[PDB]
């Protein structure tokens, strides 16, 4: 029984359990703000320091994890809300793409839209070049921001959103259940083999980016985590 869990009701520049990437910045309160509002093509990402082992080439067993977080996006004239937020998983050596252009890559892929990540994106700005659907949305991305599957979601300025991902390794089904402002929930799922698209040890994080014409406020609020691996 190999478990790894943690809790964050407020973050802070300092706590080694958390490492920053890009323009993340800690707020007077406790929240985290990924993108910078004055930089062009900004990119921010944040992830748990110590990496997590999600499977053993020894037992072949895959790990199951339960997570949940609360973010919040918010408009800001005269720019356009973009591009959004992505909850990802990446090799223990993941850096913000080389000279990343930011924009709709969500700071996790390259210009073409690819990279070595598996995540959940809360895309608010529909990017043609990546086959985004003409509306805001929740989607599953694998080694590319050209989501494998998506789902009609609605970004609400100032709305405090709440997410809950459940990974059942016995089926390898990634399950996402978003909890909007008003109550309506949005659910998305996609059977993705982690042991096949990711290395033994990986890192869990949050990325958010903006273009030149679009910049929005990206704040992460809470992120509890627990992942158990079985070894026998």
Question: Of Ca ion, Mn ion, a copy of itself, none, which one does residue 72 interact with (CB within 5 to 8 Å by kind)?
Answer: a copy of itself
124-183: contacts with Ca ion (CB under 5 A): 125, 127
Partners of 225 in beta bridges: 6, 67
CB of 133 to Ca ion, least distance (A): 9
As measured in angstroms, the least distance from the Cβ of 84 to Mn ion is 8
- As measured in angstroms, the least distance from the Cβ of 112 to a copy of itself is 27
232 by Cβ neighbours in 10 Å (0-12 / 13-18 / 19+) ranks as: exposed
Which residue from 132, 174, 190, 203 is in contact with Mn ion, where contact means CB under 5 A? 132
Q: How far apart are CA 91 and CA 115, in angstroms?
A: 11
Nearer to Mn ion, 72 or 146 (CB): 146
Nearest to 48 by CA among 199, 227, 169, 231: 227
In terms of CB distance, is 65 or 206 closer to a copy of itself? 65
How far is residue 1 from each of residues 34, 87, 193, 196, 209, measured CA to CA in Å? Answer: 34, 25, 21, 22, 37
Q: Which of residues 150-179 bind Mn ion (CB under 5 A)?
A: none
83 binds, among a copy of itself, Mn ion, Ca ion, none (CB under 5 to 8 A by kind): Ca ion
Quote the least distance from Cβ 88 to a copy of itself, whole Å.
Answer: 18
User: Residue holding tokens 């990206």?
Assistant: 218
Indicate which single residue of 104, 119, 205, 214 sits in contact with Ca ion (rule: CB under 5 A): 104
**74, interface contact from Ca ion, Mn ion, a copy of itself, none, CB < 5-8 Å by kind:** a copy of itself
Q: Under a CB-based contact definition with an 8 Å cutoff, are residues 153 and 137 in contact?
A: yes
* Residue 139 touching Mn ion (CB under 5 A): yes
By beta-carbon proximity to a copy of itself, the closer residue of 17 and 112 is 17
Closest CA to 45 of 106, 100, 93, 101: 106
The alpha carbon of 200 is separated from its chain's Cα centroid by a whole number of angstroms, namely 19
Structure tokens at 3: 């478990």
The entry of Ca ion, a copy of itself, Mn ion, none near residue 147 (CB within 5 to 8 angstroms by kind) is Mn ion
Cβ burial of 47 (10 Å; 0-12, 13-18, 19+) is: buried
Q: What are phi and psi of 45, to 5 degrees?
A: -150, 155
Residue closer to Ca ion by CB (options 65, 130) is 130
* Interacting residues with Mn ion (CB under 5 A): 123, 132, 139, 145, 147
* Interacting residues with Ca ion (CB under 5 A): 83, 104, 123, 125, 127
């Amino acid at each position: 029984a190999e478990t790894v869990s943690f809790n964050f009701n407020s973050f802070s520049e300092g706590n080694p359990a958390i490492n920053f990437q890009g323009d993340v910045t800690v707020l007077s309160n406790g929240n985290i703000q990924l993108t910078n509002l004055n930089k062009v093509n900004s990119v921010g990402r944040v992830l748990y320091a110590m990496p997590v082992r999600i499977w053993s080439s020894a037992t072949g067993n895959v790990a199951s994890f339960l997570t949940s977080f609360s973010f919040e996006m918010k408009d800001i004239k005269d720019y356009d809300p973009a591009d959004g937020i992505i909850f990802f998983i990446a090799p223990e050596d993941t850096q913000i793409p080389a000279g990343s252009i930011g924009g709709g890559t969500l700071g996790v892929s390259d210009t073409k839209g690819a990279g070595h990540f598996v995540g959940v994106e809360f895309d608010t700005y529909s990017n043609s070049e990546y086959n985004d659907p003409p509306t805001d949305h929740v989607g599953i991305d694998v080694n590319s921001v050209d989501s494998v599957k998506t789902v009609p979601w609605n970004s609400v300025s100032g709305a405090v959103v709440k997410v809950t991902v459940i990974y059942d390794s016995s089926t390898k089904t990634l399950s996402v259940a978003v909890t909007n402002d008003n109550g309506d929930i949005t659910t998305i799922a996609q059977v993705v083999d982690l042991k096949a698209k990711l290395p033994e040890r990986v890192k869990f994080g949050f990325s958010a980016s903006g273009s030149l014409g679009g910049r929005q406020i990206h704040l992460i609020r809470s992120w509890s985590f627990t992942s158990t691996l079985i070894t026998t």
